[PDB]
A paper describes a structure:
Von Willebrand factor (VWF) assembly begins in the endoplasmic reticulum of endothelial cells and megakaryocytes where VWF is synthesized as a precursor with multiple domains. The polypeptide including the propeptide and mature VWF chain (proVWF) subsequently forms “tail-to-tail” homodimers through their C-terminal cystine knot (CK) domains. These proVWF dimers are then transported to the Golgi where they assemble into large multimers ‘head-to-head’ through interchain disulfide bonds between D3 domains of two proVWF dimers. Therefore, the disulfide linkages and the cysteines involved in the VWF D′D3 dimer interface remain to be confirmed with the discrepancy mainly on Cys1097 and Cys1099. Here we identified the disulfide linkages from the D′D3 dimer interface through chemical digestion and mass spectrometry and solved the cryo-electron microscopy (cryo-EM) structure of VWF tubules with each repeating unit containing one D′D3 dimer and one D1D2 dimer.
In order to gain further structural information of the D′D3 dimer interface, we purified D′D3 dimers complexed with D1D2 derived from the expression medium of HEK293 cells transfected with expression plasmid of D1D2D′D3-wt or D1D2D′D3-R1136M-E1143M. The tubule-like oligomers of these complexes were analyzed by single-particle cryo-EM. This yielded an electron density map covering two repeating units for D′D3-R1136M-E1143M dimer complexed with D1D2 at 3.3 Å resolution and an electron density map covering one repeating unit for D′D3-wt dimer complexed with D1D2 at 3.4 Å resolution respectively. Each repeating unit contains a D′D3 dimer and a D1D2 dimer. As the overall configuration of the refined D′D3-wt complex is essentially the same as that of the D′D3-R1136M-E1143M mutant, the structure of the mutant was selected for presentation due to its slightly better resolution. The shape of the repeating unit largely resembles that of MUC2 where a D′D3 dimer is docked in the central hole of the donut-shaped D1D2 dimer8. The connecting loop linking two helices in the D′D3 monomer restrained by the Cys1091–Cys1097 disulfide is anchored in a hydrophobic pocket formed by Phe1100, Met1055, and Val1056 through Ile1094, but in the dimer, it is more flexible with the intramolecular Cys1091–Cys1099 bond and flips over to dock in the same hydrophobic surface pocket of the other D′D3 molecule in a domain swapping-like fashion. This brings two Cys1097 residues in proximity and the subsequent formation of an intermolecular disulfide bond. As there are very limited noncovalent interactions in the D′D3 dimeric interface, D1D2 is indispensable for its dimerization by aligning two D3 monomers in optimal positions for their intermolecular disulfide formation.
Author numbering:
A (entry chain F): 767 to 1241
B (entry chain H): 1058 to 1155
C (entry chain E): 353 to 740
D (entry chain G): 30 to 352
Write the structure that this text describes.
Amino acid sequence: CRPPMVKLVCPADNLRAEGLECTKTCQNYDLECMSMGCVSGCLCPPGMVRHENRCVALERCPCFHQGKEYAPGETVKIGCNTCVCQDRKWNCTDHVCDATCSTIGMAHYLTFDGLKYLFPGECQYVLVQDYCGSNPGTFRILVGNKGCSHPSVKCKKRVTILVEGGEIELFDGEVNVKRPMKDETHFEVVESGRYIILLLGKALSVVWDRHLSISVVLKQTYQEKVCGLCGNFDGIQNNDLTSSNLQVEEDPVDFGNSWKVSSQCADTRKVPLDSSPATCHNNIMKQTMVDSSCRILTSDVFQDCNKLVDPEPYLDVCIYDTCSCESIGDCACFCDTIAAYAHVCAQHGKVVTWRTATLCPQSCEERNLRENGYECEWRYNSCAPACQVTCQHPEPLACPVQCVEGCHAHCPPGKILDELLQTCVDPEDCPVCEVAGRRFASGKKVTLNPSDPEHCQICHCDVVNLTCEACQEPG
Amino acid sequence: SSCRILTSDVFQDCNKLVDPEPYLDVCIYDTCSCESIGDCACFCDTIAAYAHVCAQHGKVVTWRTATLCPQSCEERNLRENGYECEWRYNSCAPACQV
Amino acid sequence: SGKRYPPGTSLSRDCNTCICRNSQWICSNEECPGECLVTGQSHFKSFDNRYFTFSGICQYLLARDCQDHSFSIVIETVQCADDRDAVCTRSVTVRLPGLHNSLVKLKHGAGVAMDGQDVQLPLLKGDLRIQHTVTASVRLSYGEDLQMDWDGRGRLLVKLSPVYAGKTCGLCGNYNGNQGDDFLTPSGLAEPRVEDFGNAWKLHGDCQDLQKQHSDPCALNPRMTRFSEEACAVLTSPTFEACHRAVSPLPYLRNCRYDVCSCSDGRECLCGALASYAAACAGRGVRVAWREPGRCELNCPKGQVYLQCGTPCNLTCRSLSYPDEECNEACLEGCFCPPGLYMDERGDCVPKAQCPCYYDGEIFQPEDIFSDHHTMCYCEDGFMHCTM
Amino acid sequence: SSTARCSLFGSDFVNTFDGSMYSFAGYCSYLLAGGCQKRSFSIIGDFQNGKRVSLSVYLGEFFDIHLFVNGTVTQGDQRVSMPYASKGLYLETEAGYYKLSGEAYGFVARIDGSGNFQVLLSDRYFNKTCGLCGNFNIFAEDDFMTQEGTLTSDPYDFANSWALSSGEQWCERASPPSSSCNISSGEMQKGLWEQCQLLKSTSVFARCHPLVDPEPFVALCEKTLCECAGGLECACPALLEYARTCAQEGMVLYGWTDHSACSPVCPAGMEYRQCVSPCARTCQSLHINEMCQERCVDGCSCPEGQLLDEGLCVESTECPCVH
Ligand SMILES: *[C@@H]1O[C@H](CO)[C@@H](O)[C@H](O)[C@H]1NC(C)=O
Ligand SMILES: *[C@@H]1O[C@H](CO)[C@@H](O)[C@H](O)[C@H]1NC(C)=O
Ligand SMILES: *[C@@H]1O[C@H](CO)[C@@H](O)[C@H](O)[C@H]1NC(C)=O
Ligand SMILES: *[C@@H]1O[C@H](CO)[C@@H](O)[C@H](O)[C@H]1NC(C)=O
Ligand SMILES: *[C@@H]1O[C@H](CO)[C@@H](O)[C@H](O)[C@H]1NC(C)=O
Ligand SMILES: [Ca+2]
Ligand SMILES: [Ca+2]
Ligand SMILES: [Ca+2]
């Protein structure tokens, strides 16, 4: 018909004629097409396939992803995986990235493999642990809430991190090292922004928003060696509700009760399912207002992230929480459930700015005013590099989260911040010490090379002093 | 308990001049009837009213902490090419200036 | 599931067995048959228990044997009411490359038509045995590694034996016991939106792509909201309290609400949505009694009576003509008639005396005598006990 | 402009936002107007058997009011008083006609004495509304868009695609009623033909013609005139509508009812004043001028004296005190 195009005629001696009825465009090419005759119009030459009103000479045609066309050879990044498509399909890499627990809001959980469930407990529970079956194991993070079955202005959760034989439990927005870690070189607490990122090993970390948002970041090493309220981190999402007695369960509450640490505590009683949890129940007006308010997760500033991350789980969490929660002066049970989604978006590279003066204000001027003069180096920033070099951590750190939210101090170059003095000061005016002439630490109070005493020229620092004690010989 | 902030440590001086009982009843009534989701304003406003009344009597009150009606002011500087940082929150600064 | 069990018991997850030893369950780990379900307005359940909704209007590729090509199941959807959120399946098409490359088509009237011609069921062709069901359905069955189900109103169950595990691609997913990767497109890349995943599987380029998948059709017809709510609250009522621990009722509740607010006739959709959950509970083992005179007591002709747990093996007259054939079928919720009465060809079941004989298709008469010069046969009471 | 005026006048008659008159005699609730992408509100008009029974407004899906032609007005499921002011909707008797205003949502509905409906949608809903009154675009030829999104040409299919069944309505496709006129015509028609032709012949009606074409109005009154049981008034509905639409176009025609011999029905005591002030003079009212200067609206009010007192004209001397 059209001169680049060409027509055909239906042979009256067949049934699988496969004419214009079964046109083969790009995405139709792989698919299998079943017809009931033919139309005998004009179809592209049998070496090329129609695509956006043309006939692409040799097929090799674009590679759709998220409703977008990608020319061949182009690569797209998903997690740790680069994906380039040749003929027509992407041959991604096989790296497995760091998994991540989460306490989304006040009663929901999000396992390692990705599974939102609801479990409103009030006892202590095993969030994730390694003493799991045949494995010897190391760490035993536990989470314990208080009065949380009706979460309004209560349920200040507390974590207890029993790693390396040292209790590092954290509560009231303050990490509290109950007992020292045996090998303290791993342990490193990095208070940044609004978060208290904890580095408890070379393949384990904890980031905590100082109120309720607890999430454990595990690396490739573990890979089906853990179990607890966050499932067993194997990539299979169906079996994440296996109770403590090796039996997969259908109800989340039975699972949660099975993962309780103190048997003589109170089981959570199953509640009949209801769309409106507690106060949204008969007050349908309130339920509609709550729905519309939580609809901000699908708003003009969140459009970019909605294509990468599904907002439905976080929408459900927002609705449930701010229905059950009664907010009077602290509108925190609402703003936290959106800050969690913003944090996830930022972890995927989609930084979003959503706080306005009439919507979760988040002041940061109380730190500047403390100085007798206002010097103004503290400022909010949707998401800024969290894990930065200060006088307390003069050396760089491998660190789980890219950027976080909160009052991040910006101040002129060459005047690196120190945490104790909220001011930022020149590098010299810090207790940083170079014992081996290298930029190590604040003169690390760490024992060096005991099992080879031939090199044990042990040397420390307290403030700037290049102090050097002895290595007490056994005999 | 929340509206009880009117008879609190920072408001002790004002109560010697202005009785918080009308404002306490207003706070309770509004907060009960109000449904607050994203703006806890039907509470912060009923307290800001009492703070204003106290201020007009000579008792300036600072009550507004980072976990209670924060009221940030960074948006009047960031719009500039460089963060000039000249605006700030003041509990009671003169109104009709030059 | 929140109840104690003395040591030594042996529970079953309807495919595997668990033994209680030392307060721990030792459970077998065998692969199990998978079920892809297309129900309601546009509700899907994948092979790995991934519930979703997708209201697209085109011909979609539901499930294809994807490394070898022993079958391929294609579905076709149309708007099913006045709204724009009510998109239901009309007809389903199956290709059998192992059988002449033939093309079976289950139609909207619960009929069936192989390669254009209509077909009178049963059909015991080479491999596939299409025949009707107690509830006037159509049960396709290819070999023994595949099954299927009627497509009159727009429901469909596909059952695949574990010989197909991990080797099928379609709207139903890989069938690899992992729910995560079910939004997989032909280009081998999971798309985190149901609209894109659905649109990636349409067979025709002229079909309109879906842009937004609405969650509350109730908001275009507010007049319905209240009814829908109460109409579906039964799913959480003590009436279904028995099987809340066998299959969670949340997806079926959302599907019930969507179906009631969206479809044209709410009365039909309410009982087409409760029956889905009842069948899901009956799958695992729990039999629920949920019909009430208000709540859609199914009614079949006056000769028949509703049986909750019947015996679809000996009701039909044809059965008496082939007693050697085996019926390894469970009880099926439908209607039957007393054991002194057997189903007649016309449809009014009669005592086994006047019950014809189906020797080589051709139907004979309750005392017909078909003699010959070398053989002789006579239809006595549903089988020609006939000499040579 | 800034407003548009759908109107379900007469019996079974409908006048869309853009002026596409047609006839439809439904059997369940229908969708008068409301946005079709984002549905903040939805005016719904109910029928019983051809004859309309009420008007309804469904704010979101949490609030609903049912203002019945029989004066009755239920909220939700319970009969309420009048005036009513909840949820940002103000429901009150203005100029003797029940009125339901939602200026926050930009809509004003009204019911007069005989039972006619009248919806004044705003201008923000331009090209956005989607209902039995057709989309609010200036074009008047594409106003029969069904709910499927496809334009039709038979008014009954267009109207039936917008039926909104409920838990206890369950309505069905409706069909045009059989005509009985075709046997009964003749002697009456000789004089009847004048009632419709005066719509365009009469001088008072003769200046609307540059604004609104009168052919469809005479057409509809002519086709509804035959089934009249020997009466002049059986054509005055159209005339009334012709006035009202012509008034809405910005040129109100004065004193057309002097010799029309048909007058609108109004409560006893009040006469149909063409362009009466919407600002009444109730006995207990503060004399605040320059704050009650809204646009004039046609309707009926008390005589020159006789200030209002709870919908009953009483002389200015007998205004009762209240305590
Ligand atoms: C994956 O990519 C590599 C490197 O380009 C190529 O050698 C290999 O054939 C690809 N394999 C598949 C399964 O596409
Ligand atoms: C946030 O901080 C980052 C890193 O310091 C900086 O690059 C960026 O300009 C900041 N953005 C805003 C909005 O202040
Ligand atoms: C507010 O303005 C006053 C008047 O200049 C000044 O004295 C004061 O320092 C400012 N802020 C506070 C906290 O008082
Ligand atoms: C109004 O109409 C309703 C519904 O038909 C009827 O129940 C009621 O009695 C009527 N009330 C009046 C005052 O006519
Ligand atoms: C109204 O919207 C339609 C559909 O987008 C568009 O085709 C048309 O041009 C618009 N008309 C006006 C007057 O804006
Ligand atoms: Ca798992
Ligand atoms: Ca899968
Ligand atoms: Ca139009």
